[PDB]
């Protein structure tokens, strides 16, 4: 589904007491989109339990360059005590990545290998076209790191 579709269903999901989500917003285009209100057309909350989630259980983080994404996840997996996420949505990773033939492989494999190695259900929106090289790298590393 679409980013804002899976984001919507995660706040309003039923409570196991619930998911604890982290949304990683990558790229400046995506940041403008989220900060300046483009989301709130497409994601709302109605449930008491959704309202709490939208406040206490879903965390948004903005990172502007892939270098800091790598450093951030590297810091994430390095602490024993630290917030534990059941879902990690990575938004806009394809935008950052342009895009030479072998420089694209090395960056994505490093980035992809770092994300999927987290104790969460990690997902990348927008979904990259099925036949595209990032989409094929994502499937490959998912099988490897599963």
């Amino acid at each position: 589904m679409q980013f804002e579709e899976r984001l919507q269903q995660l706040v309003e999901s039923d409570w196991s007491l619930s998911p604890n989500v982290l949304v990683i917003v990558l790229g400046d285009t995506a940041r403008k989109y989220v900060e300046l209100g483009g989301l709130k057309e497409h994601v709302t909350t109605n449930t008491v339990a959704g309202h709490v989630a939208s406040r206490e259980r879903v965390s948004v983080v903005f990172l502007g360059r892939v270098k800091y994404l790598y450093m951030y996840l590297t810091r994430m997996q390095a602490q024993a005590n630290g917030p534990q996420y059941s879902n990690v949505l990575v938004y806009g990773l394809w935008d950052l990545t342009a895009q030479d033939g072998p420089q694209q492989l090395r960056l994505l494999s490093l980035v992809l290998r770092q994300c999927l190695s987290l104790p969460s259900k990690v997902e990348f929106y927008p979904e990259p076209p099925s036949s595209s090289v990032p989409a094929r790298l994502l499937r490959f590393w998912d099988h490897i790191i599963r």
Partner: protein, 210 residues
């Protein structure tokens, strides 16, 4: 210098960048023709004044898959006989004075699941349509601004509307008249914040724009 970028990275709640669905007061016919139909779909704070003790035939209609929190100070709505099956009731000693009403309303906002647990709600996947506090005149004898403050935060947070009742000015004279813009004593700080005020005259209801 990216070690310093990493040091200043900041976490935000989703709620900053998204809306909560608002619920609006539709009206029953009895009250309807005091405002533009465009002003009738913006209705988030209504306050009704009436001389009855039990709630009027219009107020019961304002209340009736979702749920509605009735803070019942009078101990009327929550009597076993009259409980509607769409309602959540808070009836308690701590809530008879305006300080304990706020502390609850603050608990509803700060930690809503503990609030609704104190109401025998153990399951929270539901929409809280609105809150109903009946009746305000018993609250202060000895803040009415603080109460509206927290009531607005509950409307932004949970998207519910607000309905309030208070007695007309005859109640505030007292027993044997010993206690002596709007025909009730609610300070205009509170009364301002209300989208629509309604007076009940004996068998008719009329708005107050003063």
């Amino acid at each position: 210098g990216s070690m310093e970028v990493l040091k200043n990275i900041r976490i935000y709640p989703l709620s900053n960048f998204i809306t909560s669905t608002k619920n609006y007061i539709n009206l029953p016919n009895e009250l309807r023709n005091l405002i533009s139909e465009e002003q009738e779909s913006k209705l988030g704070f209504l306050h009704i004044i009436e001389s009855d003790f039990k709630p009027s035939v219009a107020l019961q209609k304002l209340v009736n898959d979702e749920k509605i929190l009735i803070i019942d100070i009078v101990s009327i709505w929550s009597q076993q006989k009259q409980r509607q099956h769409g309602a959540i009731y808070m009836n308690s000693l701590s809530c008879i004075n305006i300080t304990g009403l706020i502390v609850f309303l603050e608990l509803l906002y700060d930690s809503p699941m503990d609030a609704l647990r104190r109401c025998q709600v153990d399951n929270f996947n539901f929409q809280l349509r609105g809150i109903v506090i009946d009746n305000l005149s018993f609250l202060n004898f000895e803040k009415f601004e603080k109460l509206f403050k927290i009531l607005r935060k509950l409307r932004e947070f949970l998207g519910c509307w607000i309905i309030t009742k208070s007695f007309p000015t005859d109640f505030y004279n007292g027993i044997e008249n010993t206690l002596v813009l709007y025909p009730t004593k609610l300070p205009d700080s509170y009364m301002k914040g209300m989208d629509l005020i309604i007076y009940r005259e004996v068998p008719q209801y009329r708005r107050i724009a003063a």
